[PDB]
Nucleic acid binder design. Sequence first.
DNA 1: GCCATGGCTAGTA
DNA 2: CTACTAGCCATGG
Length: 108
Amino acid sequence: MRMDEFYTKVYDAVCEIPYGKVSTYGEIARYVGMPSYARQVGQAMKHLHPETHVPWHRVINSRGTISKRDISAGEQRQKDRLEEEGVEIYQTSLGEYKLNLPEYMWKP
DNA sequence: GCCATGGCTAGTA
DNA sequence: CTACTAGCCATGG
């Protein structure tokens, strides 16, 4: 398959995530048949228009924190967002916004 | 072909 | 817990 089929399946995946639940970069890689594309799971997310109806904010790193998303602090945005779905998040000695994965993970 | 970038991740230690 | 490899693999130059 090819990179736009790929980008579509991933957005059908993500779209599936129940409000107020979450999933992992890596899991979706797996779910769409692409067990080793976790990194490109990241970039599909990275490219969305900021219009999108796709819940990119329900996607996190497989330790259950929010990805440092380097280029600058902006992914404040992801947390402020997941808290809008009553998800609970706390913090690390050292930044790492973070959560209870087993509680919020979407296990379908 | 190269390289340097990255919303990644099991392993290690 | 935190760091650190080692793999992974598309992009854009």
